[PDB]
Amino acid sequence: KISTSDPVRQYLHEIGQVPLLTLEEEVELARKVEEGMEAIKKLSEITGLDPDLIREVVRAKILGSARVRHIPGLKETLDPKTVEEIDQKLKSLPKEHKRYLHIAREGEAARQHLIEANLRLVVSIAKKYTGRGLSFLDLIQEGNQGLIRAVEKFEYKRRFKFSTYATWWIRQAINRAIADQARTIRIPVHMVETINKLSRTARQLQQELGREPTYEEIAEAMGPGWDAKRVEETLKIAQEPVSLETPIGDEKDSFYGDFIPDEHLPSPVDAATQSLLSEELEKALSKLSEREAMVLKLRKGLIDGEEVGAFFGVTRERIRQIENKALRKLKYHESRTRKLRDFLD
Amino acid sequence: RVEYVKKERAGLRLPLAAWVEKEAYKPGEILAELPEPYLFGDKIVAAIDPEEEVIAEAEGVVHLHEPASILVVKARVYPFEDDVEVSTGDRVAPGDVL
């Protein structure tokens, strides 16, 4: 049944079940999130297993079995042997060392709740960056992409509350998500902004004159390096692509598409030209002394159309030499039997 | 299971304030921490500290409630070794086969 009412209901419940204390429990899980990294960075100082490993095997022990490492990502890690053997090394750790793992686990665990809690905070912000080009659930989604991003960066030792710290990140997320996924054609953030101002000035312009500004007025208003050439160029890209499929003329069955011709293809009077050209050019190409003819047949003709790096090993002089004489001798036997005169092309 | 504390008395609890009152984390006066009934393991003075903090200088601070979480679970204390199948649970205190 109709999405979002569920995805909102899905966490209104859980959140509604565990709204973590503004300070206490946010601090709790907070503290229990840093000693995670501490721990792991130290485990690595003992296991040799890269931080990634220690960090990846503690998650698979708490959140999801072999199943999680098999589908989301292929089998670089053996469902059994790999993980199990990695954790097998964490138990072999002395009391002092096995100490951190027991922490690393509960910590990641702490990272879970904290994030689940503030999932209501996401949708709150999300409730405003609504109209752009990103679905509401999508908006929420890339919105969480900044929240969990906060979890790594926070510093409980610096007394400033969490909720507000996530705010920045979150909003940062949604914003990049707006500059990236909102259109069919990708434009840089630089031009993105360059487009708002260019559209923001048109506003104060509609305000007075009455004439929807010429690319001269809008150009002045904006500033420095803005030439009438630019604005006409900067707005064409502004407009959103038009549907290849759209009711054309007397909107009925007639689909806009048939209206656009094709080109890559040689419309018959072009294929018919190859067969004459190609067969005739090759013909005259046989009454020439192999050499130059071939190196120039293969040079312009074969690889990519530098008289110097032309012929095999003979110098430039014998290049031009037989060139202008052969080529031209070629031109005056063809002109006779008028085969290539009528410019096929 | 009970979460945080405040002030009235601190007995049979965790290692939290164990540092706030040096006596038991520097020396061994926690057994003398009682103020008067001696001349005539956890326990603290009548009431001296208020919250969850670190006291080199009251830096890491946080004044707050005390939750009474009811987690329906079975809490074992001195589990022992039964090796028919894989050694389940735990040992008294040493090895942690869990």
Side-chain angles (χ1 to χ4, degrees):
Chain A
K1 309 288 183 169
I2 304 170
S3 40
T4 316
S5 57
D6 181 301
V8 181
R9 202 169 304 151
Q10 257 192 46
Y11 15 125
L12 296 193
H13 255 298
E14 285 197 58
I15 293 169
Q17 277 155 178
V18 192
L20 289 173
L21 209 296
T22 300
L23 279 184
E24 246 319 301
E25 285 154 47
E26 290 227 323
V27 170
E28 263 187 52
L29 310 194
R31 191 206 315 175
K32 312 211 78 294
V33 164
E34 243 200 71
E35 186 62 283
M37 177 181 90
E38 283 179 42
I40 305 171
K41 242 190 180 182
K42 190 156 199 167
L43 294 178
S44 59
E45 276 196 72
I46 310 184
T47 313
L49 273 51
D50 289 329
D52 40 67
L53 261 74
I54 323 292
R55 180 163 298 153
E56 263 289 335
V57 173
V58 168
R59 293 203 190 73
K61 282 267 89 74
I62 313 294
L63 49 51
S65 49
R67 58 181 178 69
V68 73
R69 279 177 157 272
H70 187 288
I71 306 176
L74 304 168
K75 64 140 292 176
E76 232 286 63
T77 69
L78 332 173
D79 3 288
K81 255 49 201 178
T82 285
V83 269
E84 252 173 59
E85 229 215 62
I86 299 168
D87 205 285
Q88 271 164 44
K89 301 187 182 179
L90 299 189
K91 332 167 199 173
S92 49
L93 292 174
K95 247 292 169 51
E96 322 78 65
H97 307 274
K98 184 73 169 186
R99 173 244 299 211
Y100 300 72
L101 200 212
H102 283 309
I103 299 188
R105 301 289 198 87
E106 307 223 59
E108 241 298 287
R111 170 163 173 282
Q112 303 268 304
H113 311 313
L114 208 173
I115 296 183
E116 303 181 57
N118 299 239
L119 244 167
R120 230 176 47 161
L121 189 288
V122 212
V123 195
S124 68
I125 293 178
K127 230 69 179 194
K128 290 155 182 183
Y129 278 66
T130 303
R132 301 274 220 179
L134 262 184
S135 315
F136 188 77
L137 286 180
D138 276 52
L139 247 119
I140 311 155
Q141 288 313 65
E142 282 285 65
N144 301 305
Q145 185 61 76
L147 196 163
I148 307 179
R149 186 163 292 163
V151 188
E152 164 184 337
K153 300 302 185 288
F154 197 74
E155 310 179 61
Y156 112 108
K157 270 156 291 180
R158 299 185 180 173
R159 203 54 198 181
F160 53 73
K161 126 97 96 170
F162 188 87
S163 310
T164 298
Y165 191 95
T167 307
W168 186 79
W169 285 96
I170 290 187
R171 279 200 169 56
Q172 259 51 70
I174 315 172
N175 284 305
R176 166 153 226 171
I178 276 173
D180 289 357
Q181 313 170 307
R183 307 133 38 79
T184 292
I185 289 192
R186 186 74 99 99
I187 185 156
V189 191
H190 163 218
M191 317 303 251
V192 167
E193 310 178 61
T194 293
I195 269 188
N196 266 310
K197 288 182 229 63
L198 198 283
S199 190
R200 218 171 307 179
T201 294
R203 320 286 186 58
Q204 307 180 79
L205 291 180
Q206 161 67 54
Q207 167 235 55
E208 192 73 296
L209 225 296
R211 289 177 171 177
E212 33 191 298
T214 185
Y215 297 142
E216 276 59 42
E217 274 74 63
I218 172 177
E220 292 172 349
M222 235 290 89
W226 292 75
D227 163 53
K229 163 203 168 180
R230 183 169 187 173
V231 186
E232 189 195 273
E233 184 200 82
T234 310
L235 293 166
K236 288 184 172 191
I237 302 163
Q239 21 184 170
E240 243 236 75
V242 177
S243 178
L244 172 148
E245 51 180 292
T246 305
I248 225 301
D250 283 353
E251 38 238 308
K252 287 187 165 292
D253 48 300
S254 169
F255 256 146
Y256 185 25
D258 201 324
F259 279 42
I260 315 77
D262 72 328
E263 281 191 38
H264 292 304
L265 305 175
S267 62
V269 197
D270 295 286
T273 298
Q274 275 53 299
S275 165
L276 201 155
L277 179 68
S278 177
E279 239 189 70
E280 255 49 69
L281 273 174
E282 190 203 64
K283 286 178 176 181
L285 185 153
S286 64
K287 307 294 181 176
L288 299 166
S289 65
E290 183 182 300
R291 311 214 96 168
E292 277 57 56
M294 300 309 110
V295 174
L296 273 179
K297 170 187 175 180
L298 312 174
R299 201 60 248 180
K300 322 302 173 181
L302 231 73
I303 308 180
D304 190 34
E306 57 120 0
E307 312 289 309
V308 52
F311 206 67
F312 191 99
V314 184
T315 337
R316 300 173 292 172
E317 192 65 68
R318 194 190 215 169
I319 289 180
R320 171 272 252 296
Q321 210 273 45
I322 306 179
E323 183 226 7
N324 274 34
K325 289 313 93 176
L327 194 80
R328 284 175 180 166
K329 218 57 164 62
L330 151 146
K331 93 164 298 181
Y332 230 71
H333 91 294
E334 275 309 309
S335 297
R336 287 195 207 296
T337 309
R338 288 293 240 183
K339 293 183 179 67
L340 296 75
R341 157 53 216 301
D342 307 81
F343 289 66
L344 306 173
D345 194 306
Chain B
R1 178 195 185 193
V2 61
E3 295 186 64
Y4 280 75
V5 206
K6 310 81 54 291
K7 176 93 296 295
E8 76 92 10
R9 181 235 52 174
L12 299 310
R13 80 301 164 171
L14 313 314
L16 283 309
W19 251 135
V20 316
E21 47 112 357
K22 307 295 257 65
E23 307 61 76
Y25 228 144
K26 188 84 289 184
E29 281 289 72
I30 177 179
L31 176 54
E33 137 278 307
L34 56 303
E36 199 52 75
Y38 207 91
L39 210 309
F40 174 93
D42 314 70
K43 59 181 185 64
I44 229 297
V45 184
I48 64 103
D49 47 298
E51 335 96 352
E52 165 60 291
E53 62 233 297
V54 43
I55 76 316
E57 279 108 295
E59 54 263 301
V61 198
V62 51
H63 167 62
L64 251 156
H65 58 43
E66 60 313 82
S69 179
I70 320 167
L71 232 159
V72 178
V73 173
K74 180 183 172 193
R76 299 180 178 185
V77 197
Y78 280 64
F80 264 56
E81 53 182 61
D82 278 302
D83 54 305
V84 168
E85 309 129 56
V86 183
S87 42
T88 341
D90 240 55
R91 292 307 178 66
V92 183
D96 280 309
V97 195
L98 83 171

